[PDB]
Ligand SMILES: Cc1cccc2c1CCN(C(=O)[C@@H]1CCCC[C@@H]1C(=O)O)[C@@H]2CN1Cc2ccccc2C1=O
């Protein structure tokens with residue numbers, strides 16, 4: 001119903017937790033984070049907003065986060081949960097059967113191919129076999145109960161490659177690579193298709209968008225975004241993809257574009273309270 | 286067929302060496318050198334003639350990317366110039382379908398080509414076909430089932446594990462399953478119905494790992510790795526065995542020549558070149 | 573008022589500084605550049621001529637320039653200023669509120685979309701919002717206190733596109749693309765319209781000229797130049813466009829054509845002392 005936006009970066013790492021209502025286009029100002037982070041990811045399981053990974057880029061120094069904080073909408077309080085095995089900045093996340101998968105990310109110079117799964121019942125993190133490629137700024141999506149790691153950065157090369165995880169087999173397999181090289185792109189699922197919007201190809205921030213159809217196994221371009229952006233928040237709400245903020249190789253966007261798959265067009269539906277990049281977003285339900 | 290050729294290469298400067306290895310007796314033939322020394326060129330045999338395509342002449346006095354096509358006749362021991370390509374293509378990939386030589390990718394100065402063009406020996410003419418989905422230099426090319434596969438490479442910024450397939454009749458490219466490892470300047474060939482990708486450079490380390498693509502299952506599978514790490518390696522197949530020649534291992538220029546037996550799944554150093562080099566154009570006499 | 577021409581190329585990068593007086597048709601031989609340069613841009617601020625960016629082709633080495641040099645007409649002397657953040661060969665520049673905007677250009681294989689502003693009173697460069705497209709061989713024009721970047725080459729494609737900068741907002745927005753693809757075209761402003769003369773479309777050097785009406789948002793061809801040319805110097809003096817030199821594929825032009833917008837006709841008013849391409853041109857203001 002509503003769309004969260006947690007953390008981000010603008011001159012320093014942010015603690016902003018806000019919520020956008022697309023029903024009437026209003027910004028709800030909620031409780032600020034325990035610790036300011038950028039590069040963190042957001043997901044919602046059991047009506048609880050989880051803030052996974054990230055990095056506190058402050059004037060005093062930099063610290064990559066292994067912290068999992070939780071926010072119940074009613075109680076309006078951040079409650080620290082069990083931390084991950086390793087810090088994960090520039091993290092991507094997905095969920096299968098109410099279990100939060102923490103994919104890739106970075107801890108300083110360490111670029112992760114490792115993946116670990118959180119159980120909200122037990123408050124425990126367990127590792128679930130590494131990816132074929134090390135991926136930071138990775139985009140994660142789940143379709144037909146299979147988790148996809150899309151694009152990212154392996155420490156040297158930006159990636160167009162994607163790979164599919166199978167929970168029942170506990171196994172990774174490489175799929176068809178994207179047309180465009182994308183690190184820090186917005187990845188989500190809409191109408192049985194894996195969308196990949198924006199990102200960074202190694203030299204330019206992108207506004208191009210493409211989607212993977214599971215039946216054909218083919219990546220196809222769609223209408224591009226208005227503004228170029230990497231490190232953008234992304235989510236789906238009532239059959240429409242929303243993208244929030246990001247970095248354009250200079251400044252930090254407050255723009256919020258909305259994709260309509262029927263007409264194949266984007267439109268700037270709103271603006272955030274302030275410009276920021278590296279936010280983590282998730283729809284309420 | 287008979288002779289495994291090695292053309293050009295690099296050691297301190299671009300080389301013009303044409304040498305032929307007879308794998309039956311293990312002898313080396315010192316043939317007529319190239320008119321222009323090059324590295325990053327590709328080799329292929331059409332009819333009964335060896336073709337040297339593209340590359341770069343890296344000399345102390347300057348660098349020049351080559352658009353040249355030269356044809357060697359074994360009977361006369363002479364190089365004859367052919368019609369040049371539309372653009373220079375250093376670190377080029379080449380494959381042969383229906384007696385036509387396909388020039389794939391490569392670089393010209395700052396330009397990294399996704400373009401592809403086809404040579405007709407009958408007419409001595411180059412013609413551009415549909416370009417690749419990705420710009421690739423140091424790309425591996427493999428011909429299988431009358432389709433042209435472009436594997437790995439470097440787009441100017443990023444090294445690639447990605448691979449795509451061309452359909453000559455439809456004149457279009459389609460993206461296939463990416464490799465397990467990122468490979469720039471790898472040795473790519475075809476051994477009974479499987480596209481191999483040996484060695485290469487992942488952006489940090491020089492690779493000795495080898496993986497092969499099964500067209501029907503659409504999956505890459507690792508096989509026995511090479512003894513020595515190498516990128517920019519020449520490659521060919523002779524009597525059901527892959528031969529890899531020379532390359533760059535991060536500091537030295539290899540003279541080593543390893544041979545893969547697919548039955549035993551093992552590599553073995555069958556011979557060594559007269560001098561160590563990288564970026565050679567390699568081909569073999571046909572069946 | 574004098575039409576300056578600095579640097580250029582003929583067999584190698586040139587260091588010439590000459591000034592054309594359009595009233596009597598005389599050429600002045602001024603103090604040469606301290607370093608020879610081609611692909612540079614000229615502009616005048618506060619009665620001082622500035623030479624920005626470019627490349628010195630010896631050869632070799634071939635050095636792309638990040639240098640800013642200030643020519644003082646009262647002393648006939650060049651003085652070095654603070655250098656740009658990066659080298660910019662085939663640069664475009666424009667002036668807004670006494671500040672020099674360095675737009676695009678190349679440093680080797682790097683094709684810049686970055687833009688930086690110079691403050692003469694401080695002798696400092698500062699990075700502003702980068703362009704939406706990377707552009708080398710780009711033409712720059714200033715109209716209604718907005719900076720327009722037109723044409724060029726992004727590293728892959730030769731551009732017919734153009735974009736407008738908004739100093740107060742600090743952002744770029746894409747405008748209507750040109751009718752013709754142009755890199756190394758002469759871009760200037762005359763009677764509230766952006767002109768784009770000559771250049772290279774990927775196949776041929778152009779003599780066609782088109783102008784952009786900002787309100788209608790449409791490009792319209794005008795009378796073409798007599799001679800085809802790319803990498804041409806351009807300026808506007810007293811209601812008339814002047815194009816200087818250039819490259820046509822074979823020769824290096826010494827021709828100087830003059831456009832009269834009332835009659836819509838070009839005419840060769842003078843020659844340069846020697847044929848050249850990639851010159852930086854500017855005029856004494858007012
Ligand atoms: C999730 C993600 C994927 C890919 C890139 C980034 C992010 C998060 C934000 N981020 C970051 O680099 C994080 C914010 C800026 C401080 C460093 C921090 C990081 O991840 O190291 C970059 C984007 N960039 C690059 C950059 C360069 C200079 C200034 C700002 C930015 C920016 O936002």
Ligand SMILES: Cc1cccc2c1CCN(C(=O)[C@@H]1CCCC[C@@H]1C(=O)O)[C@@H]2CN1Cc2ccccc2C1=O
Nearest residue numbers: 295324325341343375376423469470516517533563564
């Ligand atoms: C076909 C191909 C694919 C991938 C890489 C290379 C080649 C050809 C040779 N090549 C090259 O870079 C060519 C040889 C060395 C001069 C440059 C030349 C080139 O293509 O620019 C590099 C390999 N490397 C990298 C390197 C660095 C330092 C010294 C040697 C080498 C080397 O062999």
Ligand SMILES: Cc1cccc2c1CCN(C(=O)[C@@H]1CCCC[C@@H]1C(=O)O)[C@@H]2CN1Cc2ccccc2C1=O
Nearest residue numbers: 581610611627629661662709755756802803819849850
């Ligand atoms: C400002 C500008 C915009 C667009 C193209 C060029 C310039 C400056 C001169 N320039 C250049 O290429 C510069 C002069 C020639 C040496 C290279 C130099 C450069 O910037 O690369 C080219 C045009 N060319 C191409 C060419 C090829 C051969 C000989 C001369 C020319 C020429 O004038």
